[PDB]
Design a protein around this ligand. Structure first.
Ligand SMILES: Oc1cccc(-c2ccccc2)c1O
Ligand SMILES: Oc1cccc(-c2ccccc2)c1O
Ligand SMILES: Oc1cccc(-c2ccccc2)c1O
Ligand SMILES: Oc1cccc(-c2ccccc2)c1O
Ligand SMILES: Oc1cccc(-c2ccccc2)c1O
Ligand SMILES: Oc1cccc(-c2ccccc2)c1O
Lengths: 288, 288, 288, 288, 288, 288
């Protein structure tokens, strides 16, 4: 099964705005380019987020990591057994992503996924944030998470769990209207409470938002002010019911896609019990 | 197998007395109602104890928790293989218990059991005790425990261990008379030394008592005084031989059913060794 | 010198509103009454805040604590040497405040101060909050702090430091207007970064606000929502430059008097270095 | 497999001398009698060492513990498969040993072994040493260990490992003469470095000695003086090469059987590596 | 007495080279300007190092910090008693240095010293390094240290100890030639092993070098490479005999003035014993 | 599979030079001889490195350890299944190596390997270094590591992983020339990041170097100076990208074979993720 989320690639209409957003506001480290994609770092990996020009204004692909070559072949085997179409990346692609091997596929609703192993690290160019943030929590929990919009949760669920090996952490009934809610399913593939959540939201984007976890509460506090000066805040500070992440949300330059910048969540294991929650926030997160 | 005891439902003749008892004396948080049952909280769960009017004056049902949907199906499979009759709860029942799924059955002697998954949590309504108690120890150890009265221990043992997957912790020969004792069997399904004990007591109740574990010794000390002012004490403070729980006992408003309020026991694991004890108390617990 | 701030008494136009405010919103424990004052608890002390009817809608007095009888006499001596008028409380007053001895005086601008020793504690009636808050940080740091409005800071400074023995922690230039700021002086008399701050604010109240410190960040988060539902929020969450308290502000029912509810500040000692800051917030605290 | 050594029974010519030896010198707690055997305690177990009159002046039996009934049946199965004769203890024997079940057998050279489960504990009669010793290290590591004399190590090895499930920790070539040594094999069945060692010593006793482990170095130091006043010392203080136990040896009242009283050894696990040592002592243990 | 070294001001011929040096190589944060001085930050202080154009190519002044106003007056008193000339800084100077008060003087050999209190902090503009360094160790130990060149050590010693209140930590005989050494005197005024060292070196600069202490060994390792790429290394990594600082040295753009970038030294207290060392390095520090 | 690297044997032209090198410079303890091999100790093992005269000036053999006899037979079985030729060491060889059993084979390119169990320990002759080093990190991680030169990495990889059970940790592309690099494969068989690395280097030696890990950074610092006085340094201090070992390199007396003396690396487990690095050093290690 997938070990963790390692990278995200976006295709956007305003690359300079995304560049400023990811460096001056979020704190990521600019790390040159690959092909027509600008690269950004959060840690020792050569890159974690990629931004390229495109009319999509959306997540273009997501990289799903394994630990070694054999594990990648085993994932190939699973995709074959499941009837999911995939192609092995060629040399050019491998060089572009800076990986030792990869399989290209899509989830049931068109999101390109790239399962890989052997990512590049550059400890000789130590991470340097572009804005005041002490660092991010990644490591074995990967880069962070994202919330995937789907038309059919059950269908999405079967694919992510049965095929990719993710596991349901919990469910929240997200209130949409007076008498309307969406059952969001939070899935883990490691100690991070969730790496991918699935929800049938009525938005025209592949994802509702992506999430990065910073080292300290102050990291989060300072970032809020940075995004507020930029006029991008969508929620006040808050804390979630299910994962206990303390965060705020903000708009990216791509309409309808947000970012969540948080701290201090609960982690999980095999002993995690599926439960249901009626609210996303234990406190805070009022919309603005 | 069952992961933990999650809830208890009582059917009683004096609902107001039980309400006062569970809030002002024990410290539970009143949490509205469901159907004709009043609900009480000990933690983040939407409810842990339910009280409804009834001539029984006894435990009406007990909820046995699993971690996810698949585990529930696996329990279904075990019940089928064992020939134990059961029915899947309907929507109405699921809504009443605030669970995502359940199987209704009885143990060999008529106690209704409800095996479930996906309980409701409401972290947005943080627990607030009705009396001075810093909190209860629950989490993965569930709500607490109870001691089940049975006519045939061996028979009860086979069901709880072979069918529900509980495990014998130890046995105590409880002195009844000058030359009379009952071999009580203490069973675990997690780190709590026991969640259910089985004993052939000569009382006309399904259970001898239920037990809640508080965070501090002072929690226990203060509760004793609360129950003493209420005239409900049945034992002085004491400490058990087998689990090292430090507690006292008191009567509930249902005749012959007691509650045990304790602190600081030993926990268990796979390395737990079955042993036999000749007394329930290492010290204290004198009857009053 | 004064060891800590032990209690506050307010005189207000809407006692029921203050009662609801201090219990349902802040979380204090109602603790009966003394004279025409309603009493509220935050810990083991018999009372910490007192509310009585009055047209003032302001702080009526503040109790400044010492450790023993001799220390109280020594404070008497200091007041004599300094020419500050004072009167020893009579039996009736002592009984009302539940103290073993006290001296009544005023600061240079009319705020009644009561220096006392031997406060009453009632550990047999353990603290029980009226709203979800795990507890407050008091002990040797006293009940909390307040910010005192003064017409003459230098004059106020000389009295609090030279006479009462407080010590300057630091100064912040609080921006009032485009080119206008007030140099607020933060003073300590123990490990709490400040117990009293002095500032020449243009408001018609003795104090700008009082501050209570809760045990956890969640305590603060939950309280914000409680005060927001009440429509009382004046600032978003934030963190101070000087003390690192993480808090929010809200209106009390007395116009122009706020409360600050915070967590996790820096403490001080003899090695504290006076410094100057140009902003009150390191992050957050935007006015609303 | 066997989980730990739980008890030892000796048959001796001088019961009063053994009584004084185990209480006044070693520090064990006298715990009445069972049949014609006097019982001694080291902890919460009803008994750990038994002494009965007999011309043997030797170890009469050793009790090998399991964790539950099923494990005992599984050991029965193993003995059957291996062709080792055994008999299930009758009620009388079970009552005498205070166990819930047992199998009686002998090792290849005549030492009676008793495999059991469900030992009696009496926490209501807390352990009280007869001499100054803070306590013994037992628990999951059992009572201690012993060194078994055998004519054929290989043969003894096959039985203890293949049949009883013990595991080789290491081997020491114990120098007997100028050019003569005995390869002693140290075996574990839990965290205790060894519970049984096997050695082809030329003595006319089933065991060379038994070993108890005390809580502190001072416990050991004080015991030495106690045994020296009794004239029983056979070795000076020392520390072993293989287990790092710091101890001294002394004669019991049964000729050629010694006791080892030690402290602070290394524990083991699955990652333990078999090694060979040329001396028993890293330092000390000179014979006297 | 002086509490710590708070800031340094240099007057140099190549301001752009110093700017690049302090940001890209050392890792300091550029923090605008004051007068014709460019400012650099290492922590929460508004500034720690100042660089202005000048033919000196040397340390122009050093700021010596106290904790409050009274302490500053007490230092004034000491200077008066000692006959050392000084002037109180005017408003303009105070504004330039961002301090609440200061006294301007020189040491016996012309180095301008500025004793101050009430420095400015700007926690609302959190420190952001210009190069990969996790942070510096400052706080109560001040910015770091420097080694002061003097023609007369005894004379310099009397001034720094008797007048400014520094204390001798230890002495090292620094080998100059085959049979030539300089007795360097290392002085502390807080927990930092030394803040100022005095030595009769034959160089035409006020100081031999200044020293900054980074949080980690990696910080130091990475900086070495940064300075080596710049061609500025003067010593290999090493560790000092007296303070145990692990560091390397490099040239600044001002000829004959170096910088020392280190980690992990010993701290001191009242119990520090004066000792003498014959070498500066316990290991490493070979000149290059 | 192999548990760890236990010993190394070299065949050299200058035995006295190797003796001085391993004792006075590295710090190993001379431990007599076996056959025509001089023995050296790093810990409690009777020997860890052996040096014998020979024209090879290279690694003559390497000992690969298991935990017990059965494991050795299991390795025999694996070699048989794989078609790798091997011979069981005779008594003489066993006595020479001081082991209880061994299998002699070669890797695909001629390096003799000796898989063994039951090594000799001599705790009665506690380790005493010949030079100032507090000790080495060995234990379950074995003696250290080495980098093996191979003509065919893929071929070498298949043997070490599939046959001996080593596991790939990571890969580094070691820059050889302007546009030339060698993909070195770092393999583990325990917690040590690597025990054997494989690389297609163009040198006429079986190994590029062997590595020992000391207890402290000072151990490493002092050793550097020792080797520098001997004129043997090949690299400055540095820290690796993949294992985070902080070390320096030096020449042994055998041309083209170096030694690496390091400290403080990362350890591994099952959760280790294969990654790729473009440099060997995160910092330092400049060649000299
Ligand atoms: O981390 C998280 C935890 C719980 C809920 C959300 C969520 C909130 C709004 C929309 C979608 C998800 C989230 O990001
Ligand atoms: O927790 C417990 C541990 C040991 C015994 C009891 C017990 C005592 C009296 C009647 C039944 C059981 C108990 O609750
Ligand atoms: O705790 C505090 C720390 C720093 C500033 C304030 C403050 C803010 C606004 C008005 C007055 C004081 C405060 O309460
Ligand atoms: O614990 C131990 C560890 C190592 C050796 C012995 C030993 C010494 C002499 C005779 C037999 C065994 C022992 O008891
Ligand atoms: O921190 C330090 C500790 C000991 C010596 C020096 C030193 C070395 C060379 C010249 C002057 C001083 C130093 O900076
Ligand atoms: O421990 C290590 C970690 C990473 C690389 C090397 C290495 C460097 C040069 C040549 C071969 C290997 C090494 O020893």
């Amino acid at each position: 099964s997938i070990e963790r989320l390692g990278y995200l690639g976006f295709a956007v209409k305003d690359v300079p705005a995304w560049d400023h957003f990811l460096t001056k506001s979020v704190g990521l480290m600019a790390a040159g380019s690959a092909g027509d994609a600008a690269l950004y770092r959060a840690d020792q990996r050569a890159w974690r987020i990629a931004v390229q020009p495109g009319e999509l204004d959306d997540l273009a692909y997501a990289g799903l990591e394994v630990d070694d070559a054999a594990a990648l072949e085993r994932m190939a085997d699973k995709l074959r057994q499941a009837g999911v179409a995939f192609t092995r990346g060629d040399e050019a692609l491998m060089q572009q992503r800076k990986v030792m091997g990869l399989l290209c596929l899509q989830d049931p609703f068109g999101l390109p996924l790239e399962i890989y192993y052997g990512p590049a690290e550059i400890f000789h160019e130590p991470f340097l944030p572009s804005a005041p943030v002490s660092g991010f929590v990644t490591g074995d929990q990967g880069i962070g998470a994202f919330v995937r919009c789907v038309p059919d949760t059950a269908k999405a669920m079967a694919f992510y769990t049965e095929v990719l090996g993710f596991v349901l952490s919990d469910i929240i009934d997200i209130q949409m209207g007076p008498e309307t809610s969406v059952p969001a399913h939070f899935l883990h593939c490691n100690g991070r409470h969730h790496t991918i959540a699935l929800a049938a939201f009525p938005i025209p984007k592949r994802i509702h938002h992506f999430m990065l976890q910073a080292n300290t509460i102050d990291d989060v506090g300072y970032a809020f002010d940075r995004l507020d000066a930029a006029g991008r805040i969508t929620s006040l500070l808050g804390r979630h019911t299910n994962d206990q992440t303390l965060s705020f949300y903000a708009d990216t330059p791509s309409p309808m896609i947000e970012v969540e910048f948080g701290w201090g969540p609960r982690t999980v294991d095999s002993s995690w019990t599926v439960a249901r929650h009626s609210r996303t926030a234990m406190w805070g997160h009022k919309s603005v």
